[PDB]
Design a protein around this nucleic acid. Sequence first.
DNA 1: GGCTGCTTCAGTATTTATACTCTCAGTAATAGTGCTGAGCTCTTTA
DNA 2: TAAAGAGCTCAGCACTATTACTGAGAGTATAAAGATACTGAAGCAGCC
Length: 71
Amino acid sequence: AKLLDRQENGFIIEKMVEEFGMSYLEATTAFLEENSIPETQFAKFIPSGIIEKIQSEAIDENLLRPSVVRC
DNA sequence: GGCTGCTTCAGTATTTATACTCTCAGTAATAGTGCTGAGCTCTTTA
DNA sequence: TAAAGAGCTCAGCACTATTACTGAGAGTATAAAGATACTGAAGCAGCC
């Protein structure tokens, strides 16, 4: 009904990758759309953790330019 | 009054120069908008 | 001395009212401005 536990959702969202195995990005976007989640009201749904690995894998995949590398 | 030759048509093999005037109209973007929380503010006395 | 109140106000997602603003409309009264070829098929056309 209500699913406001962020770190529990971390346990559930690692299930996405560790189970499916595409990437943390696509796994959690799949989560966001499955339960119909916007992108500004997420801090109430998403563990504080997965965000950091998301940033990591993002910059490592080079999603943005050198303008973002130095910082 | 039924009757044959011409006939006409129909089927094959990029990139277009000069309104005007409101006048309104209702719209979609857009700033005004107020929360939530939360994080620092602050003092308390144990 | 320092764990622990109760509040002072600043990130961070909306909302209503807005403001260019683009569209729909209604006025407009000098003129006179082309080198197939073939086969075929009904219709038309003149006749005993």
